[PDB]
């Protein structure tokens, strides 16, 4: 039960919408793990001055190796010094193609399963929309160029068009009825049943959440969810650099440079596993093309304008399309929003003029404009959408460097003891 | 962003490097 | 979050060595379950007066339905009112053949899987010797007459001959060596490796115990172990009835009748499942045929008698047979005991005279005498071994009756609410 | 072994039996 010093530096960088691992540490059952990270985060040089600050999120999860290797792990630990070695997973034969899990692809082109599987588990349990397809690549080598190097894509910050009710939301519930009569008792049950269905669709799609619904609870082992140990978030601001020569005089370049601390309070590691810490930089989806929902409606009806409570609480969801929110909105992208939601929140505004000035991190094209009539593809952040505003991604879009001070108490014979025989 | 420029010392804990004697 | 009164009576009975369920209650996620049981336990009429008291054990485990139905359960709860109904398991077409899980075999000859599987899980996680074959019957119908009606058999109380080191205990560890030299550094490692192997064999055969070894911990979900909520134990005493007629004058019959309380403190049910409570009545294995190990040795050596510490701590286990412990001991049953263990504990003594008097719950025949050269069969309590001392098993060997006061707080609409439509 | 002879009352909690009216 002595101290092991695992502190270390980390220089990293990535694409906008994608979730990248910035530091992982293997731990052992019985370990007491504490982590205090501190550093600075920056963005590649901007074409113009500063406009809006990006929002940065840092996470640190704990994942039991058992969650990865399954029964195979249990045997491993059980059989002890007789265990059949754990298998490695494969990566594409390229240095960077392991980037998502924070490591260079080693000489043999394969990395420990716990890195890959954890990243997956983390993504599937907290980052993707609950209704989106569960991410299930088997090997880092099954990942595509972008994903493998920069991490998976995550959802845009929540707004009316990026947080629609799950696409399969019921818009009407049918109930059969005998040719001339209706069982009012059945109708009653019908509603009840519906209620359970809705609650589920709207917010209890995950087992754990259903059980919470009953006022019960579930261990993280129940559904194999990575354990979130610490979540930090902050805005990334900086300064402008003044141009001073004959032609650059009166010009500006935004240099974003933000300092930040991410500290995990002493945590007890019950079983062997990994402590992964990842980052995610995003820009609120402002767009000179989005307009208030009501500004777009052609026939304004009492139900739209009035804001009559009696109606707002008993109507079904409303199906509308991106065309109804952005001028160049794609009509093929349908979303189901809650009635009179446009009266519950206001959207950001950008004069159409900024629409074509390179250097602003605004979405100068309605979301999903180049991914086709596909909702998921519009919701997930497309990092290219930002290529336009950077002088040059020599270090991708963002980048950072920080010191990770890690102290871990654990049973560990001194190096002297290891190297000495008698 | 003071520490972030300098690689930690790993001064906490016991001795790790045995290399035959003192080496600067 | 209101009270549901599940109190109830229970008249039960069973065979000696076998573990029987005495009361089970289905619970729901969010429930607060409290149980205070009280009653009396008896044994069928004895042939003679009272000799020794039997030791009774009561247990109460909690088992998440998830542990039984697996992912299939998760889906069930997830899909809610659209879930494919859970499957039932089959029993033999006989009323009593469900007895082990405390229920009469219902009209359709099938009982809910959670009853059967739990019983199994309980047995495999706490009652059988860790080295014995994991009990894996698929359906109550795969169980044999005795088991299905009376419950599985458990281990005799621990003693030198019923608690031997697991049969596969190493008695020597070989280490290869080059034709003329030996790597003393390797030898060192060899020992270390052995140590891990031993620790495992001796007491870390279960995953959970290995992890505890590291000073870590595991949830009960990790290896799917039933959660032990309360364990009670007590001796069953009674009185003698004096014979008073011309021929019975001066005769006695032992009537054992013991009162007992088994109370489970308010427990929080995190997920749907069952609260099973089982009993186990046993007789310490006294035998007019067992003798002190040293009395049986033919050639008494310094190593046996001296009790020289230096030796006792560095010799390997000792292989001996039941023949070395009982006069009619079976020589084919080998056991591996710890050196000079006979100097760490003394055995009970019964003058060979009681050897053939019917009415005493002594083992009048060396354990395993009628099961063949098989250790497991000797260790597990053979209830027939006792048939001899009972006037008549009209109610099997033991039997009891008690009131189970159960109070459970839970979200439960009033019956009025259920039956009323509007 | 006093209670053990008599089946509990189930007096705790709400009403369970609606049978049309009072029935002894």
PDB file of C-alpha atoms in Angstrom, chain C residues 270-375:
ATOM      1  CA  UNK C 270     -32.745  -2.423  -6.068  1.00  0.00           C
ATOM      2  CA  UNK C 271     -34.262  -4.553  -8.837  1.00  0.00           C
ATOM      3  CA  UNK C 272     -37.125  -6.992  -9.351  1.00  0.00           C
ATOM      4  CA  UNK C 273     -36.432 -10.480  -8.018  1.00  0.00           C
ATOM      5  CA  UNK C 274     -37.015 -13.008  -5.228  1.00  0.00           C
ATOM      6  CA  UNK C 275     -36.335 -13.138  -1.516  1.00  0.00           C
ATOM      7  CA  UNK C 276     -35.768 -16.807  -0.714  1.00  0.00           C
ATOM      8  CA  UNK C 277     -35.391 -18.194   2.756  1.00  0.00           C
ATOM      9  CA  UNK C 278     -34.114 -21.714   3.279  1.00  0.00           C
ATOM     10  CA  UNK C 279     -33.344 -24.037   6.158  1.00  0.00           C
ATOM     11  CA  UNK C 280     -30.794 -26.746   6.817  1.00  0.00           C
ATOM     12  CA  UNK C 281     -30.857 -29.195   9.733  1.00  0.00           C
ATOM     13  CA  UNK C 282     -27.750 -31.229  10.487  1.00  0.00           C
ATOM     14  CA  UNK C 283     -26.276 -33.491  13.113  1.00  0.00           C
ATOM     15  CA  UNK C 284     -22.646 -33.211  14.052  1.00  0.00           C
ATOM     16  CA  UNK C 285     -21.083 -36.392  12.559  1.00  0.00           C
ATOM     17  CA  UNK C 286     -20.295 -38.296  15.746  1.00  0.00           C
ATOM     18  CA  UNK C 287     -19.253 -41.901  15.231  1.00  0.00           C
ATOM     19  CA  UNK C 288     -18.454 -44.866  17.456  1.00  0.00           C
ATOM     20  CA  UNK C 289     -16.172 -45.906  14.639  1.00  0.00           C
ATOM     21  CA  UNK C 290     -13.874 -42.887  14.396  1.00  0.00           C
ATOM     22  CA  UNK C 291     -10.639 -42.823  16.443  1.00  0.00           C
ATOM     23  CA  UNK C 292      -7.820 -40.349  16.995  1.00  0.00           C
ATOM     24  CA  UNK C 293      -5.491 -40.261  14.027  1.00  0.00           C
ATOM     25  CA  UNK C 294      -2.521 -41.104  16.234  1.00  0.00           C
ATOM     26  CA  UNK C 295      -4.272 -44.097  17.706  1.00  0.00           C
ATOM     27  CA  UNK C 296      -4.441 -45.519  14.213  1.00  0.00           C
ATOM     28  CA  UNK C 297      -0.861 -44.981  13.041  1.00  0.00           C
ATOM     29  CA  UNK C 298       1.144 -48.229  13.070  1.00  0.00           C
ATOM     30  CA  UNK C 299       4.612 -46.745  13.050  1.00  0.00           C
ATOM     31  CA  UNK C 300       4.609 -43.599  15.197  1.00  0.00           C
ATOM     32  CA  UNK C 301       7.343 -41.304  13.911  1.00  0.00           C
ATOM     33  CA  UNK C 302       9.031 -38.200  15.323  1.00  0.00           C
ATOM     34  CA  UNK C 303       7.245 -36.219  12.646  1.00  0.00           C
ATOM     35  CA  UNK C 304       3.886 -37.523  13.862  1.00  0.00           C
ATOM     36  CA  UNK C 305       4.354 -37.309  17.618  1.00  0.00           C
ATOM     37  CA  UNK C 306       7.035 -34.727  18.396  1.00  0.00           C
ATOM     38  CA  UNK C 307       4.978 -31.800  17.181  1.00  0.00           C
ATOM     39  CA  UNK C 308       8.231 -30.114  16.231  1.00  0.00           C
ATOM     40  CA  UNK C 309       7.299 -26.686  14.764  1.00  0.00           C
ATOM     41  CA  UNK C 310      10.202 -26.586  12.373  1.00  0.00           C
ATOM     42  CA  UNK C 311       8.644 -29.573  10.652  1.00  0.00           C
ATOM     43  CA  UNK C 312       4.990 -28.721  10.959  1.00  0.00           C
ATOM     44  CA  UNK C 313       5.444 -25.498   8.979  1.00  0.00           C
ATOM     45  CA  UNK C 314       7.455 -26.770   6.054  1.00  0.00           C
ATOM     46  CA  UNK C 315       6.221 -30.173   5.120  1.00  0.00           C
ATOM     47  CA  UNK C 316       3.754 -30.832   2.301  1.00  0.00           C
ATOM     48  CA  UNK C 317       0.195 -31.976   2.887  1.00  0.00           C
ATOM     49  CA  UNK C 318      -0.304 -35.582   3.939  1.00  0.00           C
ATOM     50  CA  UNK C 319      -2.393 -38.059   2.008  1.00  0.00           C
ATOM     51  CA  UNK C 320      -4.310 -40.478   4.217  1.00  0.00           C
ATOM     52  CA  UNK C 321      -7.514 -42.491   3.857  1.00  0.00           C
ATOM     53  CA  UNK C 322     -10.718 -42.926   5.788  1.00  0.00           C
ATOM     54  CA  UNK C 323      -9.291 -46.283   6.829  1.00  0.00           C
ATOM     55  CA  UNK C 324      -6.800 -44.253   8.848  1.00  0.00           C
ATOM     56  CA  UNK C 325      -9.635 -42.603  10.772  1.00  0.00           C
ATOM     57  CA  UNK C 326     -12.434 -45.172  11.154  1.00  0.00           C
ATOM     58  CA  UNK C 327     -12.090 -48.866  11.909  1.00  0.00           C
ATOM     59  CA  UNK C 328     -14.346 -49.787   8.997  1.00  0.00           C
ATOM     60  CA  UNK C 329     -13.012 -46.802   7.146  1.00  0.00           C
ATOM     61  CA  UNK C 330     -12.939 -47.140   3.382  1.00  0.00           C
ATOM     62  CA  UNK C 331      -9.287 -47.256   2.200  1.00  0.00           C
ATOM     63  CA  UNK C 332     -10.295 -46.071  -1.251  1.00  0.00           C
ATOM     64  CA  UNK C 333     -11.287 -42.648  -0.008  1.00  0.00           C
ATOM     65  CA  UNK C 334      -8.148 -40.564   0.092  1.00  0.00           C
ATOM     66  CA  UNK C 335      -7.927 -37.116   1.681  1.00  0.00           C
ATOM     67  CA  UNK C 336      -5.145 -34.554   1.896  1.00  0.00           C
ATOM     68  CA  UNK C 337      -4.814 -33.075   5.364  1.00  0.00           C
ATOM     69  CA  UNK C 338      -2.400 -30.606   6.874  1.00  0.00           C
ATOM     70  CA  UNK C 339       0.556 -31.936   8.807  1.00  0.00           C
ATOM     71  CA  UNK C 340       0.063 -32.453  12.517  1.00  0.00           C
ATOM     72  CA  UNK C 341      -3.544 -31.316  12.210  1.00  0.00           C
ATOM     73  CA  UNK C 342      -4.495 -34.039  14.620  1.00  0.00           C
ATOM     74  CA  UNK C 343      -2.656 -31.919  17.145  1.00  0.00           C
ATOM     75  CA  UNK C 344      -4.842 -28.912  16.378  1.00  0.00           C
ATOM     76  CA  UNK C 345      -8.179 -30.543  17.106  1.00  0.00           C
ATOM     77  CA  UNK C 346      -9.701 -33.427  19.062  1.00  0.00           C
ATOM     78  CA  UNK C 347     -12.614 -35.623  17.775  1.00  0.00           C
ATOM     79  CA  UNK C 348     -15.849 -36.562  19.584  1.00  0.00           C
ATOM     80  CA  UNK C 349     -16.017 -40.019  21.208  1.00  0.00           C
ATOM     81  CA  UNK C 350     -18.740 -42.624  21.380  1.00  0.00           C
ATOM     82  CA  UNK C 351     -18.144 -45.974  23.066  1.00  0.00           C
ATOM     83  CA  UNK C 352     -18.481 -48.674  20.456  1.00  0.00           C
ATOM     84  CA  UNK C 353     -21.462 -49.928  22.415  1.00  0.00           C
ATOM     85  CA  UNK C 354     -23.869 -47.305  21.030  1.00  0.00           C
ATOM     86  CA  UNK C 355     -22.654 -48.540  17.669  1.00  0.00           C
ATOM     87  CA  UNK C 356     -25.758 -50.668  17.133  1.00  0.00           C
ATOM     88  CA  UNK C 357     -28.443 -49.165  19.347  1.00  0.00           C
ATOM     89  CA  UNK C 358     -31.157 -47.749  17.156  1.00  0.00           C
ATOM     90  CA  UNK C 359     -32.315 -44.293  18.203  1.00  0.00           C
ATOM     91  CA  UNK C 360     -29.070 -42.375  18.353  1.00  0.00           C
ATOM     92  CA  UNK C 361     -28.275 -39.938  15.541  1.00  0.00           C
ATOM     93  CA  UNK C 362     -24.682 -41.111  15.419  1.00  0.00           C
ATOM     94  CA  UNK C 363     -23.107 -42.300  12.172  1.00  0.00           C
ATOM     95  CA  UNK C 364     -23.068 -45.990  13.038  1.00  0.00           C
ATOM     96  CA  UNK C 365     -21.067 -46.637   9.844  1.00  0.00           C
ATOM     97  CA  UNK C 366     -17.923 -44.843   8.642  1.00  0.00           C
ATOM     98  CA  UNK C 367     -18.952 -42.008   6.337  1.00  0.00           C
ATOM     99  CA  UNK C 368     -19.127 -43.093   2.702  1.00  0.00           C
ATOM    100  CA  UNK C 369     -19.544 -46.743   3.652  1.00  0.00           C
ATOM    101  CA  UNK C 370     -22.379 -47.199   1.179  1.00  0.00           C
ATOM    102  CA  UNK C 371     -21.526 -44.725  -1.545  1.00  0.00           C
ATOM    103  CA  UNK C 372     -18.291 -46.290  -2.723  1.00  0.00           C
ATOM    104  CA  UNK C 373     -14.710 -45.030  -2.919  1.00  0.00           C
ATOM    105  CA  UNK C 374     -15.963 -41.490  -3.622  1.00  0.00           C
ATOM    106  CA  UNK C 375     -15.017 -38.515  -1.449  1.00  0.00           C
TER     107      UNK C 375
END
